[PDB]
């Protein structure tokens, strides 16, 4: 219960460019209430900015600096929503 | 800032063996949001992965293929955590 009811989507969960923000959204509504957390694993640090919007919807953007393969993960009460973690490739600026 | 509230330990921070996955763990729940970085320095490349599980424990595992003296760094928000880097003797199979 809880996590399976959450949904996320965006460009940020399918591909990104080194240096340029990768955005996506999460919708909780229908799940319990508690805590959403987002994590990025890969060959470089990630700057993650977070926004709860008075919509019961939440919006995310992060930056990474190195090409390579990353894993973005969204978790509700410390467990993965459907499709988390998302295998997200990063390529160099054009 | 914040790295001083992070702890690590386990057999992978003490010795390891070539071709054999080596494990240790990190406690972060007392430092909140941030970034971990793990570096492994020495004679050959390492494969590394986190295991972030539903306890809220954080695990690291790595595999190097060559005997020798490696060093495992663990920093949080670019600062070293207590006792990092770690001198890790990696012995033959």
């Amino acid at each position: 219960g809880g996590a399976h009811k959450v949904r996320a989507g965006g460009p940020g969960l399918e591909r990104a460019e080194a240096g340029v923000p990768a955005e996506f959204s999460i919708w909780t509504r229908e799940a319990g209430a508690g805590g959403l957390a987002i994590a990025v694993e890969g060959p470089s640090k990630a700057e993650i900015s977070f926004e709860d919007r008075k919509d019961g919807s939440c919006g995310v953007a992060y930056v990474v600096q190195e090409p390579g393969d990353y894993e973005v993960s969204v978790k509700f009460n410390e467990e993965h929503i459907p499709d988390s973690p998302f295998v997200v490739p990063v390529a160099s600026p054009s | 800032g914040g790295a001083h509230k992070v702890r690590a330990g386990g057999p992978g921070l003490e010795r390891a063996e070539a071709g054999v996955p080596a494990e240790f763990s990190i406690w972060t729940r007392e430092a909140g949001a941030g970034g971990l970085a793990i570096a492994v320095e020495g004679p050959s490349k390492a494969e590394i992965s986190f295991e972030d599980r539903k306890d809220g424990s954080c695990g690291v595992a790595y595999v190097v293929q060559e005997p020798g003296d490696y060093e495992v760094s663990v920093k949080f928000n670019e600062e070293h955590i207590p006792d990092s880097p770690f001198v890790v003797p990696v012995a033959s199979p």
């Binding site: 957390a37 060959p43 | 492994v40 020495g42």
Partner: peptide, 18 residues
């Protein structure tokens, strides 16, 4: 010939508040 060469392997993990 006086250099030290070694291999350096990195992984990172950044995560978020609530």
């Amino acid at each position: 010939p006086l250099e030290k060469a070694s291999v350096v392997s990195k992984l990172f993990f950044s995560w978020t508040a609530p």
